[PDB]
Amino acid sequence: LPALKLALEYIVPCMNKHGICVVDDFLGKETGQQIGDEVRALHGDKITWIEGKEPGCETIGLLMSSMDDLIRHCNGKLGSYKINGRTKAMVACYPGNGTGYVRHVDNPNGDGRCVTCIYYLNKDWDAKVSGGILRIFPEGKAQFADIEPKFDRLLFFWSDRRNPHEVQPAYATRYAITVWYFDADERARAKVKYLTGE
Ligand SMILES: Cc1cccnc1CN1CCC2(CC1)C(=O)N(c1ccc(-c3ccccc3)cc1)C(=O)N2c1ncccn1
Ligand SMILES: [Mn+2]
């Protein structure tokens, strides 16, 4: 599906109906492999915050710009949100050391973030061997979903209490990149609570 059709015919209806949406083969093999190389070159869990213009991060920047265009093509149809910006990218290297993340909500208290977008980099990742599954518990539903951290897979989900999630421990190093998109009204309300530079 082309980006306009992908947004309007798949991401929008899927987010509105389920609050979670998986796009496989988002950028293609060549672009995905370049992003994987850049992330491995960056120098317990290791988190680095990336704007996209740093040396050796050009293809990470391309991923970010591509996620931005896809969101733009949703034409304000994602929930009631007016999306006008996003965070930097959280580039994460998770060692396979048998630690996980307890069930949590990314934005439980109105900090501005409305959509979590995760891009995965793990080729031939077997969850039954290496672990690292993301388990999402959509609010009020009888079912939950385990998401495999597949190479070139883009995951969207609402960042608020609709999607508590936990991360299973892993036995091989996992790499993922996350951005969060802001709702204009929520982000404006968050900014009345303090002063510049604080
Ligand atoms: C690790 C993981 C894997 C899969 C799914 N979820 C998670 C965890 N969640 C995802 C990552 C998590 C915790 C929740 C998270 O949202 N923000 C975060 C917090 C605040 C803003 C912000 C930015 C601008 C304005 C307002 C707010 C942006 C991001 C972290 O800094 N985070 C984090 N996480 C681990 C180590 C350090 N920091
Ligand atoms: Mn999370």
Numbering used by the authors: 188 to 230, 253 to 407
Paper excerpt:
To inform the SAR work, crystal structures of tPHD2 in complex with our 1,3,8-triazaspiro[4.5]decane-2,4-dione compound series were pursued. We obtained a structure of tPHD2 in complex with 11 and MnII (substituting for FeII) (S2 and S4 and Table S3†). The new structure reveals that 11 makes similar interactions with PHD2 to those observed for 17.13 The 3-methyl pyridine ring of 11 penetrates into the 2OG binding pocket. The active site metal is chelated by the tertiary amine of the piperidine ring and 3-methyl pyridinyl nitrogen of 11. The biphenyl substituent of 11 is positioned in an aromatic pocket formed by the Trp-258, Trp-389 and Phe-391 side-chains, with which it makes hydrophobic/π-stacking interactions. The terminal phenyl ring of the biphenyl substituent of 11 is positioned to form a cation π-interaction with the catalytically important residue Arg-322.17,18 Arg-322 is also positioned to hydrogen bond to the imidazolidine-2,4-dione ring of 11. The pyrimidine ring of 11, which is not present in 17, is positioned to form a π-stacking interaction with the phenol ring of Tyr-310. The 3-hydroxypyridine derivatives 38, 41 and 44 were produced because analysis of the PHD2 structure in complex with 11 suggested that replacing the methyl group of 11 with a hydroxyl group may form additional interactions with PHD2, via hydrogen bonding to either Tyr-310 or Tyr-303. The inhibition results with these derivatives reveal the pyrimidine ring has a minor role in enabling potent tPHD2 inhibition, i.e. the non-pyrimidine containing analogues 23 are only somewhat weaker compared to 11 (IC5011, 0.253 μM; 23, 0.741 μM). Prior analyses of truncated PHD2 in complex with a spiro[4.5]decanone inhibitor reveal a binding mode involving chelation of the active site metal (Mn(ii) was substituted for Fe(ii) to produce a complex stable for crystallization) via the tertiary amine of its piperidine ring and a pyridinyl nitrogen.13 Chelation of the active site metal of 2OG oxygenases by a pyridine ring is well precedented, e.g. with pyridine carboxylate inhibitors.
